[PDB]
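Hello everyone,

My group is preparing for a crystallization screen and wants a predicted model to guide construct design. The compound we'll soak is manganese (II) ion. Before spending weeks at the bench, it would help to have a computed complex in hand. I've included the protein sequence and the ligand's SMILES below. Output in structure-token form would be ideal because that's what our pipeline reads.
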Amino acid sequence: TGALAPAKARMRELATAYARRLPGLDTHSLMSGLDATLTFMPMGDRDGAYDPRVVLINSRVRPERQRFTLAHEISHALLLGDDDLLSDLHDAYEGERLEQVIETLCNVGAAAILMPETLIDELLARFGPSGRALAELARRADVSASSALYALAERTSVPVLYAVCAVSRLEEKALTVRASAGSPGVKYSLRPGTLIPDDHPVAVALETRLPITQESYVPFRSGRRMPAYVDAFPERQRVLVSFALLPK
Amino acid sequence: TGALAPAKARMRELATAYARRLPGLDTHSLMSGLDATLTFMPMGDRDGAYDPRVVLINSRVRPERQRFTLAHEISHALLLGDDDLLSDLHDAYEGERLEQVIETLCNVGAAAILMPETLIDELLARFGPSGRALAELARRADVSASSALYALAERTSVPVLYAVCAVSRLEEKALTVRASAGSPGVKYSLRPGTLIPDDHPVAVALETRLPITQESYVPFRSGRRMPAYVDAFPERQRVLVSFALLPK
Ligand SMILES: [Mn+2]
Ligand SMILES: [Mn+2]
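Reply:
Good plan to model first. Here are the tokens for the complex, ready for your pipeline.
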């Protein structure tokens, strides 16, 4: 219900087309088709900046995030390029809502360029709806775990709650859910900052540095333990996990 | 004879070390260890700019040249980093001579990072002292043909005059020698702008778009025809060629 879904489809079309024109999905190739001045400067904590036409990217953030920022700005330009899509958006949204839709479309396009549906479907085929597949997508696409989490969950055909867990400053430091996403049908969500029990398979994966795949529970902050099969892949001081909700 | 040779060795050492620290030789990885603001802006025809600490690269030049420019600035910083090398240079050269030595060392270091000796020796082993090996080095290293030409010629153990030929504005357009280099012992050089005869194998390669390997002559502007075996590889509207001078 809404003009966002058809707009997202058009964004993916434009993004996929620009990608095929690119020699590769390498950061340099993306910069090549930017068609605008791009400046990488240190600037505390921020994904990046847009262009009127000068694009800016923080050099303190990890390269993966800079890649997504660049794809976002490419998608923004691609959007402002197609007059039809822009007219459709302006004939449907206005003010903050239009800005939110544009931002969402830019993020939708960025993922379409960096993470192709083929790659995701192939990885889901080889590794299944698992945290290992999440790790593969993030590495094979050189993207942040959070970005891959949303893309992988969107194309999962089974009830799965993917999650990216890592050590956090909490309130001193502990393993917390950094990001979470559910497959199209999942009716649950994992609060960011949720603490991972030390006895939990995800924590064992971080300590052992070995992939852990066992039946466990979703570590809800309510002390509730929803039965689920957990596939945890440890990587870069972060644990990519898959919570397969089981009917029980 | 001179302090340049030992300086070049130290430059290669520092450059090789920084390269091994890099995750890969991808343009992004090189930018990661720049440790300085980098800005890509259109600016007519120019390889790039140095930093006091902001590096600048022309966006109108091909990506391969931008890669070499980035490696050059990394080598320059690497040079200014090692106090010993800089002291040695200042204890040996001064004024314009020092600037020339620094520039040469920066170019020596840039090639060391982008084109490893292993890669060159491997390609020379599989394809031999040929224009095909020149094409492979330029592609496998994502570097300009001119840069690869000098690196390949430096490690060729046989008398070979490598050359990069392409269509030029001449004085209207014709196939001309864009760049040339000889193996360590070659006692000849090919003038840039030398015209390639239409009957010459190099020209046939450009028209046929097929690799040509036959016995021919070095097309000297003096009408002189020095006997040589010619291996011409056509690629990207440019012909990478190898002139194997034969004793005869
Ligand atoms: Mn934007
Ligand atoms: Mn310099």
